[PDB]
Amino acid sequence: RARGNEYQPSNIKRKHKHGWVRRLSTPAGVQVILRRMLKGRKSLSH
Amino acid sequence: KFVSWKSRTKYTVKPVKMRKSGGRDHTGRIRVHGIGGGHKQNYRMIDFLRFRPEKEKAPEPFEEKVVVVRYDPCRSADIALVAGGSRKRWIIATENMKAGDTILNSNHIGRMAVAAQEGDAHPLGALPVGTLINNVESEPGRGAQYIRAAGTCGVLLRKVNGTAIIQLPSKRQMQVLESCTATVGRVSNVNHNQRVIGKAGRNRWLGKRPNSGLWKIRPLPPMKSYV
Amino acid sequence: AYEWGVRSTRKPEPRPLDRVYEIPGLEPITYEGKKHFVPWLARPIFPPWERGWNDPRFHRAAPIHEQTLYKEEPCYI
Amino acid sequence: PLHRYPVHLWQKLRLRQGICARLPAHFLRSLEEERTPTPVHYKPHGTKFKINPKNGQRERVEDVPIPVHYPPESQQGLWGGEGLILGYRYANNDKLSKRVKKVWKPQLFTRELYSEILDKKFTVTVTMRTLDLIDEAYGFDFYILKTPKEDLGSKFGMDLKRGMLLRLARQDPHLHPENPERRAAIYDKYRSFVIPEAEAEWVGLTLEEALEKQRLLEEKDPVPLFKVYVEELVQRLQEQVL
Amino acid sequence: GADRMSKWTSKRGPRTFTKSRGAKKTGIYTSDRKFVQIKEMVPEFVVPDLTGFKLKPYVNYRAPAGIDTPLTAKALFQETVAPAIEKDFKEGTFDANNLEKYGFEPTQEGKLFQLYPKNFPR
Amino acid sequence: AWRRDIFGRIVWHKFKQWPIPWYLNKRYNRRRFFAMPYVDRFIRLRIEKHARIEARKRSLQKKKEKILHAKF
RNA sequence: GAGCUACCUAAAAACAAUUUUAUGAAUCAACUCGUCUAUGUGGCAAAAUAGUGAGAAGAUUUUUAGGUAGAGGUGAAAAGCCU
RNA sequence: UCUCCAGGCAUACGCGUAUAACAACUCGGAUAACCAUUGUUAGUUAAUCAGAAUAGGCAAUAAUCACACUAUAAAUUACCUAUAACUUCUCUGUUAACCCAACACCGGAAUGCCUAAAGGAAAGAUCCAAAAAGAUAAAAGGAACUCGGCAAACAAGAACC
RNA sequence: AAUUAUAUAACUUAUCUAUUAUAUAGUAUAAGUUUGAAAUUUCGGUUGGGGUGACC
Ligand SMILES: [Mg+2]
Ligand SMILES: [Mg+2]
Ligand SMILES: [Mg+2]
Ligand SMILES: [Mg+2]
Ligand SMILES: [Mg+2]
Ligand SMILES: [Mg+2]
Ligand SMILES: [Mg+2]
Ligand SMILES: [Mg+2]
Ligand SMILES: [Mg+2]
Ligand SMILES: [Mg+2]
Ligand SMILES: [Mg+2]
Ligand SMILES: [Mg+2]
Ligand SMILES: [Mg+2]
Ligand SMILES: [Mg+2]
Ligand SMILES: [Mg+2]
Ligand SMILES: [Mg+2]
Ligand SMILES: [Mg+2]
Ligand SMILES: [Mg+2]
Ligand SMILES: [Mg+2]
Ligand SMILES: [Mg+2]
Ligand SMILES: [Mg+2]
Ligand SMILES: [Mg+2]
Ligand SMILES: [Mg+2]
Ligand SMILES: [Mg+2]
Ligand SMILES: [Mg+2]
């Protein structure tokens, strides 16, 4: 079949998988934010 | 995120909605293969402690009336709604139970043998040796755990002093105190073993996923040149 | 005697009290002053809270036996 | 660039600035000092010199303590300095065999112990070593009071010390009430450990607990500047009248 | 392919997602979904009578501006409280207990407008 | 009040009005005003990052004055 | 990292006409699939088009949200699938 | 106005101003016209469409026009007892030719209603060479073609391993 | 295949409790033994090329 369209957008799924609240739930996710803040990212999370 | 559906504290006769597992545990991983989908079902809270006196009543033999003998999706046997006093409770039905029958639930330990009528619950001491029994409990007050399937009846082989020997359906002999309560008779749906599934779809209606397609004596040193 | 309600689904028992409370004469140091939880200080014990007035949206009734119309004799309705 | 101070000095500099500076001087000494715990899991060298057998010459010897892991469960009991030894072994005890991870664990028992100064019985997780130490100390109360923090190695144990020291320091009449004679005997028996009331309060406090205590002590709501200016005006007016 | 940089608003997302634009609430939602507006929760604009008011938006360029002296607690205290205490002290009718006589408030509780924590908007 | 957030910074926290005390609110108790030890490395990296910027900033000003003095 | 895909949980949907019967039955749409040939081969397409075909009330198909994660998961075993 | 083609209108999800007017004619549309491009100004209006008090007691009897009818895979807050309150309309979604496939991609894309009253244009101009692709017709013969009836057919029937 | 293997399972001796006349029970641990879920590493040479052989 034709590939390349593995992305089926959904705002509920997106904010649940990669959102602010999700990232802070576990210590490893908090360190994801810490790295991005140190790097200077304009977007810490979705 | 797995929260067990078995969270209802209080007994009721209303059928309760069940959530299916799929063979997976609270971790989310398969722990048993071959379970999945099937028909949606409701759980009717069975009561296996036959001699449960009604609340605020004395502990002596009582009687109950059989309202209906019904099909149960969650077990091989069939269930009977029984009413006595102001209480209704589901119970397992014996081979010959019909609506309108009356069944005794006795606490008294008969010093002599008591005539056995199918469906009545008596302590093993009361019953005579050889009587077919079902819904046996290991210890007084525990509740019935053995001989609870369809048409499965065990025998009471022997009674000596304060204990008796029970022959479980597997032919494995078990021993229990004569105070334990055992229901008389067979367990109904005796032909369950005669049922024919017929088509692969029928097992997928009962929640049975198909089997997977994947298709030991170490010799001692003195006997390795002959292997 | 099968009891309905699997233990996992029951509300969990309160956490065991800090051992500093056992020792008599000793005043525990807790995070009450900070006004927030911290894992390395002792857990405060607060007295029951009274709003000082009745809020209709959060009314809570008295138990059955404390009701004015409570009667020991049973009425079948 | 470079930091001004080596990283190992950072903790000392932190204690020396801010609210940490205002903490009691005696309390800081306990924080500052580091003392090795009494050997538990290794045999110390009796002497400072030994004769090397291979070459038959005298060579210096030193004691290197084993690294021991103290699970947080230990801080709620009284282990007598014992802990977990996380290390490796050689299979079959030859260094030409494989190196295998090994963990040596203390044998833990639950025992109930009575404190005279507190007049209470505690149920504690304990090792056979801890019981031996109490026997050598001639009493449970003596064990807690004699043993130092490094040897004690338990936050529960250190809290017991503060209560006992505070009990003795204040001569609290809450001990065996209605029996001044019985109380008097207990306090007399442990008279050697009496210390001033102010010091005993800060015994066994962690740095965070100590800091919260200090913040509570000096916490004060501001003074309405109405009063402050009133005080100044009255003083000036009174002085002029003089 | 979702946009990570633009602001999350109620226009985005499914219908179930809703959130406010910063307008203050004026009522309560009871069970069965009934909105009950509270009259006290709705702000009231206190507008004065401007009839006979001599001040207009702009000022004469000929009007001299003044030297800036931002108000300080000392300046407020001296203008208002000093005259009374000084006169009273000479009269001798002064004590620490009666500071309320000169306008001091020991506590802000019970006042409609509390200076801390502020309980009124601009 | 002055509080430390979960990322290890010191931030002024502005209080909010609630009808119940803090120990009874469950939405307030989810907010954490402390940092776990895994933040310690990131605390040092911020200080070192800031020190580099300031050192560069001082160096540049010194170089600029050299240009001024040569020019004037 | 399970918005693809494998499997699962919960809550929902779709199936005309015709003949059999009382159905994992038949003919054949919608829908699902991808047998054979041709075109295409930097193409419309990093797997399509046009025809021809298989299933089409079921172990059917589809929608939404959740679960299982790499020493692992899933698997009607193709060492398939896990962007 | 004529000639011809035959999935259109809504909602969900998604997207995020591509909406509309004017002015521009550089960039973008695989070329022009014209704009989907650039700049400026505007826009989507809801009490019905759509989104967002406490404590006890208790439930046997599917659905399918639910009657008959059997069946098997066995299948959806209410009603009561007391307590408490004793007149309320704010907030948010609303545009478009749109989304996922690097593109104005012959692909992918759920549901309701309907099947032309809605929606559309296969040819920039010319020329009719070869080779190549597709459709239709075939004198006489009818598998002699070919690895093989592949492909096609005015055929689509019968049997056997 | 070689080297290991507090994966599970078992026993044995201590350690710690209960009891008992020495004794049978159990066991937040240590030391053995048995079982082996696993883990790590390797794939000498010469011989139209592949069986075996052989050879160094
Ligand atoms: Mg991609
Ligand atoms: Mg999808
Ligand atoms: Mg097989
Ligand atoms: Mg999914
Ligand atoms: Mg049909
Ligand atoms: Mg069919
Ligand atoms: Mg077909
Ligand atoms: Mg067919
Ligand atoms: Mg499959
Ligand atoms: Mg195979
Ligand atoms: Mg991939
Ligand atoms: Mg336009
Ligand atoms: Mg124009
Ligand atoms: Mg424009
Ligand atoms: Mg609505
Ligand atoms: Mg619209
Ligand atoms: Mg193109
Ligand atoms: Mg039209
Ligand atoms: Mg055209
Ligand atoms: Mg042409
Ligand atoms: Mg033709
Ligand atoms: Mg011809
Ligand atoms: Mg030929
Ligand atoms: Mg042939
Ligand atoms: Mg053909």
Q: Give Cβ neighbours of residue D170 (< 8 Å, ≥ 6 apart).
A: D197
Q: Are D205 and C29 in contact (CB under 8 A)?
A: yes
Q: How far is CA B110 from CA B52, B178, D191, F47, in A?
A: 19, 11, 73, 87
Residue A14, nucleotide of least CA–C1' distance: G3
Task: Calculate the angstrom distance between C1' of I14 and CA of D128.
Answer: 15
Q: Exposure of D17 by Cβ count < 10 A (0-12 exposed, 13-18 middle, 19+ buried)?
A: exposed
Give the C-alpha separation, E20 to E37, whole Å. 17
Q: Which of A34, A36, A37, A39 should be substituted to probe chain F, the one whose Cβ sees the most F Cβ atoms within 10 Å?
A: A34
Give the C-alpha separation, D227 to B138, whole Å. 82
| DSSP symbols for chain E | ---SSS---TTSS-TT-----SPPP-EEEETTTEEEE-STTS--------TT----SS--TTSPPPPP----HHHHHHHHTHHHHHHHHHHT---GGGGGGGT--S--TT-SS-TTTT-S--
- End-to-end, the C-alpha distance of chain B in Å comes to 54
- Ligand 14 geometric centre to CA of E7 (Å): 24
Does the N-terminal peptide bond of residue C14 adopt cis geometry, omega within 30 degrees of 0? no
Give the C-alpha separation, E3 to D36, whole Å. 58
Chains C and F touch (3+ CB pairs under 8 A): yes
Q: Which of A33, A10, A9, A11 is closest to A20 using CA atoms?
A: A33
Give the C-alpha separation, F22 to C36, whole Å. 8
Longest dimension (CA), chain E: 82
Helix (H, G, I), strand (E, B) or coil at F44: helix
Residues of C in contact with F11 (CB under 8 A): none
Q: Give Cβ neighbours of residue D204 (< 8 Å, ≥ 6 apart).
A: D149, D155, D158, D159, D161, D162
Q: How many CB atoms lie within 10 A of CB B118?
A: 17
Give the C-alpha separation, D114 to D141, whole Å. 8
Give the C-alpha separation, F24 to E29, whole Å. 22
- Geometric angle at alpha carbon B76, from B73 and B81, rounded to 5°: 65
Chains E and B touch (3+ CB pairs under 8 A): no
Q: Which residues of C6-37 are buried (b: 16+ CB within 10 A; e: fewer)?
A: eeeeeeeeeeeebbbebbeebebbbbbebebb
Give the C-alpha separation, D211 to D14, whole Å. 13
Helix (H, G, I), strand (E, B) or coil at D104: strand
Residues of A in contact with E17 (CB under 8 A): 11-12
Q: Are B133 and B182 in contact (CB under 8 A)?
A: yes
Q: Which of B132, B64, B122 is closest to B95 using CA atoms?
A: B132
Q: Are B120 and B83 in contact (CB under 8 A)?
A: no
Angle between helices E82-91 and E73-80 (to 10 degrees): 50
Helix (H, G, I), strand (E, B) or coil at D240: helix
Which helix (DSSP H) or strand (DSSP E) does residue D85 occupy?
strand D85-90
Query: In the β-sheet with B132-136, what is the strand arrangement from edge to edge?
Result: B87-92, B79-84, B62-70, B102-105, B121-123, B181-184, B132-136, B154-160, B163-167, B173-177
Q: Which residues of D192-214 are buried (b: 16+ CB within 10 A; e: fewer)?
A: ebeeeeeebbbbbbebebbbbbb
Helix (H, G, I), strand (E, B) or coil at D49: strand
Q: Give Cβ neighbours of residue E28 (< 8 Å, ≥ 6 apart).
A: C57, E35, E36, E38
Q: Give Cβ neighbours of residue B140 (< 8 Å, ≥ 6 apart).
A: B177, B179, B180, B181
Query: What are the residues facing D121 on neighbouring strands?
Result: D114
Give the C-alpha separation, A10 to A16, whole Å. 10
Q: How far is CA E59 from CA C42, E55, E67, E69, in A?
A: 64, 9, 17, 20
Which helix (DSSP H) or strand (DSSP E) does residue D123 occupy?
strand D120-127
Q: Which two tokens stand for residue D107?
A: 């044998």
Q: Which of D76, D124, D127 is closest to D104 using CA atoms?
A: D127
Q: Which ligand is nearest to the CA of A6?
A: 1
- Output the 3-class SS for chain A: CCCCCCCCCCHHHHHHHHCHHHHCCCHHHHHHHHHHHHHCCCCCCC
Q: How many CB atoms lie within 10 A of CB F13?
A: 14
Q: What is the resolution of this structure in A?
A: 2.8
Query: What are the residues facing C26 on neighbouring strands?
Result: none
Residue at token pair 């205490």: E85
Helix (H, G, I), strand (E, B) or coil at C77: coil
Q: Which two tokens stand for residue E89?
A: 């002290």
Angle between helices D225-241 and E82-91 (to 10 degrees): 40
CA neighbours closer than 13 Å in the CB half-sphere of residue D5: 8
- Output the 3-class SS for chain B: CCCCCCCCCCCCCCCEECCCCCCECCCCCECCCCCCCCCCCEECCECCCCCCCCCCCCCCCEEEEEEEEECCCCCCCCEEEEEECCEEEEEECCCCCCCCCEEEECCCCCCCCCCCCCCCEEECCCCCCCCEEEEECCCCCCCCCECCCCCCCEEEEEEECCEEEEECCCCCEEEEECCCEEEECCCCCHHHHHCCCCCHHHHHHCCCCCCCCCCCCCCCHHHCCCC
Q: Are D129 and D82 in contact (CB under 8 A)?
A: yes
The whole-angstrom distance between residue A9's C-alpha and the CA centroid of its chain comes to 14
Residues of F in contact with C55 (CB under 8 A): 19
Method by which the coordinates were obtained:
cryo-EM
Per this entry, what is the length of chain B? 227
Q: Exposure of B119 by Cβ count < 10 A (0-12 exposed, 13-18 middle, 19+ buried)?
A: buried
Which residues of chain D between 62 and 101 are close to nucleic strand I, CB under 7 A?
Answer: 73, 91-93, 97-98, 100-101
Residue at token pair 């209906």: B68
Q: Which residues of E75-95 are buried (b: 16+ CB within 10 A; e: fewer)?
A: eebeeebeeebbeeeeeeebe
Residue D72, min C-alpha distance to chain F (Å): 15
Q: Are A34 and F7 in contact (CB under 8 A)?
A: yes
Q: How many CB atoms lie within 10 A of CB B64?
A: 23
Contact E89 D237 (CB under 8 A): yes
Q: How far is CA B196 from CA B171, B191, B192, B202, in A?
A: 26, 11, 9, 10
| DSSP-derived secondary structure letter, D32 | H
Summarize chain D as % helix, strand, coil (round to 5).
45, 15, 40
Q: How many CB atoms lie within 10 A of CB D158?
A: 20
Q: Which of F63, F62, F40, F48 is closest to D1 using CA atoms?
A: F48
Q: Which two tokens stand for residue B45?
A: 């809270």
Helix (H, G, I), strand (E, B) or coil at C22: coil
Q: Which residues of B3-41 are buried (b: 16+ CB within 10 A; e: fewer)?
A: eeeeeeeeeeeeeeeeeebeeeeeeeeeeeeebbeeeee
Q: Give Cβ neighbours of residue D115 (< 8 Å, ≥ 6 apart).
A: D121, D122, D140, D141, D144, D160, D164
- Ligand 17 geometric centre to CA of B126 (Å): 91
Contact C29 D166 (CB under 8 A): no
Q: Are B156 and B124 in contact (CB under 8 A)?
A: yes
* Chain C residues in contact with chain B using a Cβ-Cβ cutoff of 8 Å: 1-2, 4-6, 8-9
Q: Which of F3, F33, F39 should be substituted to probe chain C, the one whose Cβ sees the most C Cβ atoms within 10 Å?
A: F33
Helix (H, G, I), strand (E, B) or coil at D172: coil
Contact D229 E104 (CB under 8 A): no
Give the C-alpha separation, C20 to C43, whole Å. 10
Q: Are C35 and F22 in contact (CB under 8 A)?
A: yes
Residue numbers of D between 212 and 241 with CB closer than 8 Å to E: 224-227, 229-230, 233-234, 237
Give the C-alpha separation, D195 to B150, whole Å. 79
Q: Give Cβ neighbours of residue B77 (< 8 Å, ≥ 6 apart).
A: B92, B93, B148, B149, B150, B151, B187, B188, B189
Residues of C in contact with B6 (CB under 8 A): 4-6, 9
Residue at token pair 């002085």: D239
Q: Are D104 and D42 in contact (CB under 8 A)?
A: no
Contact B49 C2 (CB under 8 A): yes
- Ligand 3 geometric centre to CA of B215 (Å): 5
Residue at token pair 């030890």: F37
Give the C-alpha separation, D164 to D136, whole Å. 19
